[PDB]
Structures are given as C-alpha cells and as structure tokens.
Write an enzyme that holds these catalytic residues in place. Structure first.
Site, PDB file in Angstrom:
ATOM      1  N   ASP A  25       0.779  -1.222   0.000  1.00 32.94           N
ATOM      2  CA  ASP A  25       0.000   0.000   0.000  1.00 32.94           C
ATOM      3  C   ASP A  25       0.819   1.285   0.000  1.00 32.94           C
ATOM      4  O   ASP A  25       1.287   1.740   1.044  1.00 32.94           O
ATOM      5  CB  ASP A  25      -0.917  -0.060   1.226  1.00 32.94           C
ATOM      6  CG  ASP A  25      -1.970   1.016   1.227  1.00 32.94           C
ATOM      7  OD1 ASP A  25      -2.815   0.988   2.145  1.00 32.94           O
ATOM      8  OD2 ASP A  25      -1.936   1.864   0.319  1.00 32.94           O
ATOM      9  N   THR A  26       0.961   1.878  -1.177  1.00 32.34           N
ATOM     10  CA  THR A  26       1.737   3.101  -1.319  1.00 32.34           C
ATOM     11  C   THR A  26       1.062   4.299  -0.671  1.00 32.34           C
ATOM     12  O   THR A  26       1.709   5.314  -0.425  1.00 32.34           O
ATOM     13  CB  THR A  26       2.025   3.429  -2.802  1.00 32.34           C
ATOM     14  OG1 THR A  26       0.798   3.541  -3.524  1.00 32.34           O
ATOM     15  CG2 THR A  26       2.865   2.334  -3.434  1.00 32.34           C
ATOM     16  N   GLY A  27      -0.234   4.181  -0.392  1.00 33.52           N
ATOM     17  CA  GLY A  27      -0.964   5.277   0.231  1.00 33.52           C
ATOM     18  C   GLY A  27      -0.894   5.216   1.749  1.00 33.52           C
ATOM     19  O   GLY A  27      -1.473   6.056   2.443  1.00 33.52           O
TER      20      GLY A  27
HETATM   21  C1  LIG Z   1     -14.939  -5.700   4.169  1.00 32.26           C
HETATM   22  C2  LIG Z   1     -14.222  -4.371   4.118  1.00 32.26           C
HETATM   23  N1  LIG Z   1     -13.160  -4.144   3.417  1.00 32.26           N
HETATM   24  C3  LIG Z   1     -12.699  -2.878   3.530  1.00 32.26           C
HETATM   25  C4  LIG Z   1     -11.470  -2.369   2.796  1.00 32.26           C
HETATM   26  O1  LIG Z   1     -10.377  -2.225   3.651  1.00 32.26           O
HETATM   27  C5  LIG Z   1      -9.305  -1.441   3.459  1.00 32.26           C
HETATM   28  C6  LIG Z   1      -8.453  -1.693   2.353  1.00 32.26           C
HETATM   29  C7  LIG Z   1      -7.321  -0.841   2.131  1.00 32.26           C
HETATM   30  C8  LIG Z   1      -7.056   0.245   3.012  1.00 32.26           C
HETATM   31  C9  LIG Z   1      -5.905   1.146   2.775  1.00 32.26           C
HETATM   32  C10 LIG Z   1      -6.181   2.638   2.388  1.00 32.26           C
HETATM   33  N2  LIG Z   1      -7.189   2.648   1.321  1.00 32.26           N
HETATM   34  C11 LIG Z   1      -8.376   3.249   1.235  1.00 32.26           C
HETATM   35  O2  LIG Z   1      -8.796   3.934   2.148  1.00 32.26           O
HETATM   36  O3  LIG Z   1      -9.117   3.085   0.112  1.00 32.26           O
HETATM   37  C12 LIG Z   1     -10.540   3.310   0.009  1.00 32.26           C
HETATM   38  C13 LIG Z   1     -10.878   3.859  -1.374  1.00 32.26           C
HETATM   39  O4  LIG Z   1     -11.060   2.691  -2.208  1.00 32.26           O
HETATM   40  C14 LIG Z   1     -11.577   1.621  -1.409  1.00 32.26           C
HETATM   41  O5  LIG Z   1     -10.856   0.399  -1.662  1.00 32.26           O
HETATM   42  C15 LIG Z   1     -10.140   0.006  -0.479  1.00 32.26           C
HETATM   43  C16 LIG Z   1     -10.837   0.713   0.726  1.00 32.26           C
HETATM   44  C17 LIG Z   1     -11.403   2.003   0.056  1.00 32.26           C
HETATM   45  C18 LIG Z   1      -4.941   3.491   1.982  1.00 32.26           C
HETATM   46  O6  LIG Z   1      -4.220   2.782   1.004  1.00 32.26           O
HETATM   47  C19 LIG Z   1      -3.996   3.872   3.136  1.00 32.26           C
HETATM   48  N3  LIG Z   1      -4.669   4.738   4.075  1.00 32.26           N
HETATM   49  C20 LIG Z   1      -4.330   6.158   4.012  1.00 32.26           C
HETATM   50  C21 LIG Z   1      -5.048   7.005   2.935  1.00 32.26           C
HETATM   51  C22 LIG Z   1      -6.577   7.104   3.154  1.00 32.26           C
HETATM   52  C23 LIG Z   1      -4.392   8.388   2.774  1.00 32.26           C
HETATM   53  S1  LIG Z   1      -4.995   4.102   5.640  1.00 32.26           S
HETATM   54  O7  LIG Z   1      -6.002   4.880   6.317  1.00 32.26           O
HETATM   55  O8  LIG Z   1      -5.440   2.734   5.597  1.00 32.26           O
HETATM   56  C24 LIG Z   1      -3.522   4.208   6.553  1.00 32.26           C
HETATM   57  C25 LIG Z   1      -2.611   3.106   6.590  1.00 32.26           C
HETATM   58  C26 LIG Z   1      -1.399   3.216   7.321  1.00 32.26           C
HETATM   59  C27 LIG Z   1      -1.093   4.429   8.012  1.00 32.26           C
HETATM   60  C28 LIG Z   1      -2.002   5.523   7.977  1.00 32.26           C
HETATM   61  C29 LIG Z   1      -3.206   5.415   7.252  1.00 32.26           C
HETATM   62  O9  LIG Z   1      -1.498   6.548   8.700  1.00 32.26           O
HETATM   63  C30 LIG Z   1      -0.240   6.121   9.216  1.00 32.26           C
HETATM   64  O10 LIG Z   1      -0.020   4.776   8.759  1.00 32.26           O
HETATM   65  C31 LIG Z   1      -7.925   0.479   4.128  1.00 32.26           C
HETATM   66  C32 LIG Z   1      -9.038  -0.358   4.346  1.00 32.26           C
HETATM   67  C33 LIG Z   1     -13.423  -2.064   4.361  1.00 32.26           C
HETATM   68  S2  LIG Z   1     -14.734  -2.968   5.004  1.00 32.26           S
END
Ligand SMILES: Cc1nc(COc2ccc(C[C@H](NC(=O)O[C@H]3CO[C@H]4OCC[C@H]43)[C@H](O)CN(CC(C)C)S(=O)(=O)c3ccc4c(c3)OCO4)cc2)cs1
Lengths: 99, 99
Positions: A25-27
């Site tokens: 996860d690059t994000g």
């Molecule tokens: C069943 C279900 N499946 C699901 C799907 O489950 C997922 C699958 C993937 C992820 C990871 C997240 N992705 C994300 O929010 O994507 C959203 C938009 O497209 C959709 O597809 C996937 C979930 C959703 C980002 O890549 C990293 N994030 C930062 C972004 C928003 C800038 S973070 O918040 O996760 C993070 C990580 C590490 C960190 C941090 C923050 O801060 C410090 O370290 C989260 C939940 C939900 S319910």
C-alpha cells in the site's frame, strides 16, 4: 518482479514465525496488521484514514520477511479491514512505482 | 519514470478544469477526492477503510489527467483526509509496482 494493478497487490509475509497476507500500500505511511499477536512492549498510537481514526499498538524493531526480503521496522497492530504494508517497509524492500 | 517511496507519492491531477494534488495509492480500489465539486448526476456510495466507513458521491465517466495521461474513470467525492488515486485509475495510466 513487476506487479500490475488490475487486482489488489497482495503478498505473503512472515512475521512472528507465521505467514499472513498483506496489501502493498503506497498510500499508507505505516504498516498495520490485524490478524497477529506480537510479543513484548508497545506504544499506544492513533492513525487516521478514510472513515476516521483508530487506536492501535505500535511495535518497534519487528523482524518481517516480505517477498524475498528480511527487514526490520515498525508494525502497528489493531483494527483494520485489511492487512497493510506501508511505505516504511516498502522502501526497505526496494519497491517502487513505475509508469 | 520511477517513483521511490521514501516520501508520499503525490502527483498533480487535472479534473473539472482544475488542478489538484493526490496520492498514488495501490491500497485503494477506488479514487476518492475531497477538495473538488463535480458536475452532473451521481450515485450515493459507501466505502470503508481504517477507522470505519463513510458516505461519498460516485461520479462515473469522469475525464481526468494524471502523469501526462488523459483517462476516464469513476471518481468518488466525499470526506477523506487525503486525495487518493486508486487502482481503477492507476491501471489505466500504466502504473506498476516493481521490486
Ligand atoms: C470488508 C471491508 N473491506 C474494507 C477495505 O479495507 C481497506 C483496504 C485498504 C485500506 C488502505 C487505504 N485505502 C483506502 O482507504 O481506500 C478506500 C478507497 O477505495 C476503497 O478500496 C479500499 C478501501 C477504500 C490506503 O491505502 C492507506 N490509508 C491512508 C489514505 C486514506 C491516505 S490508511 O487509512 O489505511 C492508513 C494506513 C497506514 C497508516 C495511515 C493510514 O497513517 C499512518 O499509517 C484500508 C481499508 C473495508 S470494510
């Protein structure tokens, strides 16, 4: 190797002597895993994302093997709907984005 | 070009005749932007991530320019602490993970 993104970039990792699956996860700044128990002391931490923030445990200097690399880094353990490998570890394994 | 991950992979995008910055996010299935207003009809949608779910607007067939590529895809508009470019668009611009 190269990984195209038509599917989620899931890889197998080894941590605490056990195998798990996680998303490259690059994000993600940090690495967050939900289905593991790590030994030793930890620091409480709060991370935020889509949907809001959540409390997790911060474990430091955790040995982890991803792909074919054995690196050490911080691993957060707590609620997350998906195991995530963040940039803190992707950089150490030499993973890059190309286009 | 290649993008190393020691920093967040932020890129400039153009959508609705306006310039914004967003994160190339391999951990995101979809693209979510918070600081823009898009024209036309939309469908309500709920997405989930770290911290929980959130309601967003789903705009389809949106023209967007990223990394010199002019593509069309679905763009979600709603609350998010960071603008995210998901795999739905990264695939179309030929972005891959390599290590
Ligand atoms: C069943 C279900 N499946 C699901 C799907 O489950 C997922 C699958 C993937 C992820 C990871 C997240 N992705 C994300 O929010 O994507 C959203 C938009 O497209 C959709 O597809 C996937 C979930 C959703 C980002 O890549 C990293 N994030 C930062 C972004 C928003 C800038 S973070 O918040 O996760 C993070 C990580 C590490 C960190 C941090 C923050 O801060 C410090 O370290 C989260 C939940 C939900 S319910």
């Amino acid at each position: 190797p190269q990984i195209t993104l038509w599917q989620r970039p899931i890889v197998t990792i080894k941590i605490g002597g056990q195998q798990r699956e996680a998303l490259l996860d690059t994000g993600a700044d940090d690495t967050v895993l939900e289905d593991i128990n790590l030994p030793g002391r930890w620091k409480p931490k709060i991370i935020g994302g889509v949907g809001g923030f959540v409390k997790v445990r911060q474990y430091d200097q955790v040995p982890i093997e991803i792909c074919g690399h054995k690196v050490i880094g911080t691993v957060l353990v707590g609620p997350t709907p998906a195991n995530i490998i963040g940039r803190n570890l992707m950089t150490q394994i030499g993973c890059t984005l190309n286009f």
